[PDB]
Design a protein around this nucleic acid. Structure first.
Lengths: 78, 93, 97, 108, 321, 97, 78, 102, 91
DNA sequence: TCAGATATATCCATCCGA
DNA sequence: TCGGATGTATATATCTGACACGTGCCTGGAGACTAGGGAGTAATCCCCTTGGCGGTTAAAACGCGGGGGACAGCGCGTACGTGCGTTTAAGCGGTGCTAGAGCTGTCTACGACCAATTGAGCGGCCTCGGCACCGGGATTCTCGA
DNA sequence: TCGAGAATCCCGGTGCCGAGGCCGCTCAATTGGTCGTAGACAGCTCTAGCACCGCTTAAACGCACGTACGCGCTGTCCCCCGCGTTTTAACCGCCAAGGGGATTACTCCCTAGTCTCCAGGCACGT
């Protein structure tokens, strides 16, 4: 229900930083699907890797390892 | 000399699958390649997870976690569904 | 007063936000979204703030890359406005479709 | 010393079991290899191979040919959805491509 | 006329040295306390005391708070702290310092009872300090100190007539009491260019003068000795005696440095630096135009050392500053 | 006298090539090209025939993928023919610069 | 100059197998260049892995391993 | 030190311990820590030198993360080395298409 | 904890004497070093296992470095590695 | 315990196409 | 014509050095010294790459339409940025409260090791039946009408 | 809609070679013992997560307005699909020929392992 939180000006700013010139109407709604799909496909595996250690709180190293196994390595977050 | 393969096991499983099917030698080769690739991927994931948890030996729980991590989607839900039922049989002793 | 040129403001600040290193996304909404998406996998799991920040960083990176690639692909259409079909084609050709 | 039963015979699995334990032990992939891990790995391999072979047999029966052909296997593999995700960057030798044509380019 | 301020800064410096382990704070607090106590006037405001050297914003604020409230909240809190008091008590015994006190308090050793119960946790120096901490805490009377010095000189002469023994320090300076004995030894055969000290120690212990030994080397030997009682009176408390053997070319410089006082030594060093010489505990060396120290000058007497820096020789009784 | 439609034979050829599974490249030219390309790196290299066949297979796969990508992109470009600009764009989008 | 071996009929046939309809008159050079790039970027590592074995013959399994490293993993042969 | 004896910079013994206990191979060789440390030092030196050139061009006095990002993404060799890696708070290189500009 | 931070600082000082390093920069560099070490080690292990040998030696690491690194950097690195191996072996 | 530097904010005397 | 944007002068937000010397403690990574198992070395089949010669023909190169797609331009209108006035939740600190991360000492069930014991999978060899290929036949789609 | 001619499905009358049938045969999988320890668990301590509360304010939302760029439409011409025709080098058949790769017995020597060995930092005390 909170998926509408990402403000239209916010996504507009992000795309402007990406190097665009004009944003049509439907793209603002359509970006939500991509964001949700990527976030879900990350968080599910992250939580699985977290639970495999019989812990209870999500650890940053768990997210790093999951992203690496997801094929996107982001070095810097410890 | 001699080399290892899974030809006999593959043939037996295929006979179990259907009693009226043929296949070529190249098909057996492709099947052997698929089997080896999947086994290697599973072993690598297991070793990495074990090192991450900083334990010392591989136990079936780690294998189950890796299988849940690797295989694509709902098929794994069926696949793992066999394994415990498989494991219980050995647990049947 | 002085009416600016069409897109003069739009063409402006592209350099400003291009050199930016901030998150450019509301934080508490991102945390709420993360928790809500997480609520479907398992029940009542705690989270660390640094992990949430890193997740936001990775998400921003991926979204920025996809949008920039979509704009570049739409340039080949000889059009100046990005449309949903363009993003669809970009995702399909990206191999992750 | 009675007639001993193999581990796969003891637990009712088809694919090799002991050789899998030997390969895992000699694979240098761990300090110590457990017990149930070989059984689970062999069972998973058996299930995956069974699914692929069943799809192949369905395809071959549809195509009216008694022996499984590599192209038939490739078509069966790429036809499904889950297997397509699991095997998304593998090129089957002398496999072929799925029969499909773009709709917009088609004359009408 | 700042006895109370000096007493409070004494505890502040002890906390900074032994509890806070801050030499850069302990030295500053001790200097501020000395400057306050050396002023022959009552401190009325912290700004008034800030004129004297060694007192800064913290020192002036502490003096003002002590004047206003009669004490310091920090000082009272540190006094009421059980761990800090235990550390101070453990470090009060010689051989145990800041880390020793910290380890003892962390291990529960907070009183002398625990130290007596944990003598196995005490080294030879630590056990020696534990045995005679009260004896080390007592002062040495001038009569007892003179008797011990005469006995030590007799032992040195009997061991070797060529041995030269000097009782330096406040004993040389003529003070009515001392906390320990500091002996300087010289010998013709040992110069700037090893068993003499061991022989001296053996000779002293043979007459049962030195009672305990904490460390004995070829250069300096430290122990516990006491003037004997005449079979009917109470035994004299154990006193710490340290004897250092110095070269003949360095004996005079060492005696001049150890005779005191610290203010007198600093004034002598400043006068020598203004006179183009550098005076150390080893010898006195010429100073060049670029400040490079030359070959150290030969030393044979304190008068020669005083004349080297072109300064009048001063008696140790007049060596207060 | 009787000729088919201007581009109807193309669809039949597309169907015929799609159904088949042949090699589609003459073996001798590929072997010669492999020898010539390998001559630059190391001298006097002796290969086995199976390696040549496998290299032909992989090359065919890569070229097929690139061509399919170009066709899809050009379709997204609202044009019928395939031109080198589309190939450059397709190679750029997948990250092959 | 063996690069001219790939004939126009061959390129057209391959593209048709891909499902192309109309190919412009400026495709041959680009196709040849792309093929050269791919073949070089594979064969260099192939020869390197062969030489690491200190053998004078290039094995097919070496080509398979090199293709796996370059992100192909084409099963089947070998 | 062994690294000092070889005139290296990183602790070679640490690399030896990590490789031995890393369960990556059966037996440890002879001078593997030396070669690994040399390669690591060369790569680190190259990255740091490019960063220093960029920072001197930036008229700044500290290694900002954006400086590292610009240095890594400004040279072709480094771009190929770590193309599929992200950096935190790094931003993107300044670029605008010529066709869109007025 | 133990990391490569001290060696990184020393190397940075040797490379340039008039620069500063952010803490986040230090973390980024530490991650880069760890990642490079892991990748090289994994490639070496795979090469060793495929070659039907039983130990990891200098030639294997050199071949892996040739396989993984980009061209000009690979040439310079091979030169540096050869020189360092000669220096250490000369002991 | 302390200022002495040093890195780091502004601003308002200029410069430019837009 | 002027607002956004380059510097230099000037004032905050941090970082920082100013005793050391003599004498004992206190450990985490260098040397010293096997051994025996892993790697280098020499000799010999062989088979598998290499190279070569000749017919042979399906495949490839090349000239010739015309016609259908690429491209170029024009109007128009409608989706979309732009200015502005309002508003709601996001920071920005607080404050307190505690489930849960983490760490430490048993001990024990289990995994590694080893010497008999044995039989399931691998090597080598038939064979007849799934597969194959033309071959002529009939069947069916279409593009100028 | 319609025909002449090209693309497509089929029965079978042959062959044909290789996928699956068989046996002969060991070296790896099993049994039944042993010992030596990794983590399972039980029990503890200390914190980073979690839950509000009030203030400030600033990015976000909704609404008017001009305008340009996306999107229809048009003609125009040029290169390429299809066609037929004349060369030819792949391709298949055959041959030899020799050298780099397997193997196999032999010898050497280098790291795992064990065990001293220390001096480069910590403290007291001043």
């Amino acid at each position: 229900d909170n998926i509408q939180g990402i403000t239209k000006p916010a996504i507009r700013r992000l795309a402007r930083r990406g190097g665009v010139k004009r944003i049509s109407g439907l793209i603002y709604e359509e970006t939500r699907g991509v964001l949700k799909v990527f976030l879900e496909n990350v968080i599910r595996d992250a939580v699985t890797y977290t639970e495999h250690a019989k812990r209870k709180t999500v650890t940053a190293m768990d997210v790093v390892y999951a992203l690496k196994r997801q094929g996107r390595t982001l070095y810097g977050f410890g | 000399s001699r080399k290892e393969s899974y030809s006999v096991y593959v043939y037996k499983v295929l006979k179990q699958v259907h009693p009226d099917t043929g296949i070529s030698s190249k098909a057996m080769g492709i099947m052997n390649s698929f089997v080896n690739d999947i086994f290697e991927r599973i072993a690598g994931e297991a070793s990495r997870l074990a090192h991450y948890n900083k334990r010392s030996t591989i136990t079936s729980r780690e294998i189950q976690t890796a299988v849940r991590l690797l295989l694509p989607g709902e098929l794994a839900k069926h696949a793992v569904s066999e394994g415990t039922k498989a494991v219980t049989k050995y647990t049947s002793s | 007063p002085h009416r600016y040129r069409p897109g003069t403001v739009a063409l402006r600040e592209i350099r400003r936000y291009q050199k930016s290193t901030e998150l450019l996304i509301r934080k508490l909404p991102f945390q709420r979204l993360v928790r809500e998406i997480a609520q479907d996998f398992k029940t009542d799991l705690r989270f660390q703030s640094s992990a949430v920040m890193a997740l936001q960083e990775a998400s921003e990176a991926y979204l920025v890359g996809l949008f920039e690639d979509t704009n570049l692909a739409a340039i080949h259409a000889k059009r100046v406005t990005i449309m949903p079909k363009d993003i669809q084609l970009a995702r399909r050709i990206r191999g992750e479709r | 010393r009675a007639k001993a039963k193999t581990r796969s015979s003891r637990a009712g699995l088809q694919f090799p079991v002991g050789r899998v334990h030997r390969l895992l032990r000699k694979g240098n992939y761990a300090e110590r290899v457990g017990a149930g891990a070989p059984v689970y790995l062999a069972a998973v391999l058996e299930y995956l191979t069974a699914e692929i072979l069943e799809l192949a047999g369905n395809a071959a029966r549809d195509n009216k040919k008694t022996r499984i052909i590599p192209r038939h296997l490739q078509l069966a593999i790429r036809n499904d959805e889950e297997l397509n995700k699991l095997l998304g960057k593998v090129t089957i030798a002398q496999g072929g491509v799925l029969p499909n044509i773009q709709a917009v380019l088609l004359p009408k | 006329l700042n006895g109370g301020i000096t007493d409070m800064l004494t505890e502040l410096a002890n906390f900074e040295k032994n509890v806070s382990q801050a030499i850069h704070k302990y030295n500053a607090y001790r200097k501020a306390a000395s400057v306050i106590a050396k002023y022959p006037h009552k401190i009325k405001s912290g700004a008034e005391a800030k004129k004297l050297p060694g007192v800064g914003t913290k020192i002036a604020e502490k003096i003002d708070e002590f004047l206003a409230t009669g004490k310091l909240r920090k000082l009272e809190k540190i006094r009421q702290d059980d761990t800090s008091s235990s550390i101070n008590f453990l470090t009060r015994v010689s051989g145990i310092g800041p880390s020793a006190a910290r380890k003892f308090v962390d291990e529960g050793i907070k009183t002398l009872e625990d130290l007596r119960k944990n003598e196995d946790k005490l080294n030879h120096h630590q056990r020696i300090g534990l045995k005679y901490f009260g004896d080390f805490e007592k002062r040495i009377p001038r009569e007892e100190m003179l008797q011990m010095q005469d006995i030590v000189l007799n032992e040195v002469k009997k061991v070797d007539s060529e041995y030269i023994a000097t009782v330096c320090g406040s004993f040389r300076r003529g003070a009515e009491s001392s906390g320990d004995m500091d002996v300087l030894l010289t010998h013709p055969s040992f110069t700037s260019e090893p068993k003499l000290l061991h022989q001296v120690v053996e000779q002293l212990q043979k007459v049962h003068f030195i009672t305990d030994t904490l460390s004995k080397g070829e250069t300096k030997f430290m122990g516990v000795c006491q003037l004997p009682s005449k079979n009917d009176e109470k035994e004299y408390p154990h006193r710490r005696i340290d004897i250092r053997l110095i070269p003949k070319d360095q004996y005079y410089c060492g005696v001049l440095y150890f005779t005191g006082s610290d203010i007198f030594n600093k004034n002598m060093r400043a006068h020598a630096l203004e006179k183009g010489f550098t005076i150390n505990e080893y010898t006195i060396r010429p100073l060049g135009v670029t400040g490079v120290a030359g070959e150290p000058l030969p030393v044979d007497s304190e008068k020669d050392i005083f004349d080297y820096i072109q300064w009048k020789y001063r008696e140790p009784k007049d060596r207060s500053e």
